[PDB]
Amino acid sequence: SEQESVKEFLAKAKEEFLKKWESPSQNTAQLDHFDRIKTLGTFGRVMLVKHKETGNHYAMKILDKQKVVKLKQIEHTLNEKRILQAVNFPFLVKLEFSFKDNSNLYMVMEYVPGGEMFSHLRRIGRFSEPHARFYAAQIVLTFEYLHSLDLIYRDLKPENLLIDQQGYIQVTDFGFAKRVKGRTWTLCGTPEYLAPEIILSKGYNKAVDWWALGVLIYEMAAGYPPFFADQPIQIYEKIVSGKVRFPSHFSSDLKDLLRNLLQVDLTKRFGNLKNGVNDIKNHKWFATTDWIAIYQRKVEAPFIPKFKGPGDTSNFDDYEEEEIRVSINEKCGKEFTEF
C-alpha cells in the first residue's frame, strides 16, 4: 500500500546484513583461480587479478598472517572480512571471494578502475563545491547505512575512496571498521582525520565518522585538510584546539556545515543530535542535493575517469612488484580460524 519509508528501508537493510553477519561466507575461491597482473596499492598489498574462468578482473587484497599478528591487527582483520562480506550498498565495494592459505589471507573485491579520489584531488588541486558535494552526498548516505547496522567505519580519507566508471564513489578498506553498540576506545585511523575524542582517549562513538566527513569535505573543497603539519603530534594539537580556518573561496553554506561537523564537542556535532543524519541532509549546503537520485545513481557525475578497456591501470600509480610466497607450513592457523 503505502510507499516504503526510510525506516522501513533501513530495517530491511538490517535484516539482510544480520543474516550474513551471523553466518559469514568462508573459503569461496582459491589462489590458482586467478592470474596476477599488477600491484594497485600497498601488512600487505592489493593486486589486480584476472579470474581464469570468467575473465573478470578483480582487486585482490593480500595480507601476510604473520605480519597481522605482529602488528596486533588480528581482531581488526577479522572485523574487516566479517563486515565486508555482510554489507550491500551502492557505494560500498563488493567482496566477491575470500580465502586463506598457509601464509596469507585473501579478499577479492570488484575492480574499480577509475583510481583513488586521492590521485584526482591532488592532481586537480581542489574540487568545486558542486563536485565535492556530489561525493559528500554518497558518503552521507553510506554512513547512514553503516551506522544503522551499528558499524563505525573509522578510516575515511580520499585514499580509500575509489572512483568507478560512472564517476561514483566506492568505499574500500574496512580495516578499522567495527560493529559496536555504544562506545569504543581504539586509537586508530589516519592522523588528519581523527576526531578530538579519539586523540583524548575518552571513548567515542559513530560521531567520529561525521567529524571525518567534515575533514573530507574540507579537503575536497580546499585541496588541503583543515589540520596539517609535518608530524602527527602537531596535527593532534591543532585538532583538539577547537580552531579551524577556512579558505576565502568557501561559500557561507559550506563554512556553516563544516563548523557543525568539525565540532569538537561531540554533543553539539551534526550527525549526533536528536535528528541524526537529517541535520546533515537538510543543511543548506545540500539544498540542491536530490538524495534519492544520488542513491539511485541517476545524477550525472562531475567527471568520468579515462578508461582504455578492461584491466587498464592507468589511473593507478606503479608499485614495486614482489612475489607471493606461500609457505609449506601453515602459519597462525588458530588465530584466523573464522576467516
Partner: peptide, 19 residues
C-alpha cells in the same frame, strides 16, 4: 599562502593509518 605551506609539507602523499 596556506596552499603553498601544504604543498611544501611532508604529508601531501598517501597517508598511512595509525594504530
Amino acid at each position: 599562502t596556506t596552499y603553498a605551506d601544504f604543498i611544501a609539507s611532508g604529508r601531501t602523499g598517501r597517508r598511512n593509518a595509525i594504530h
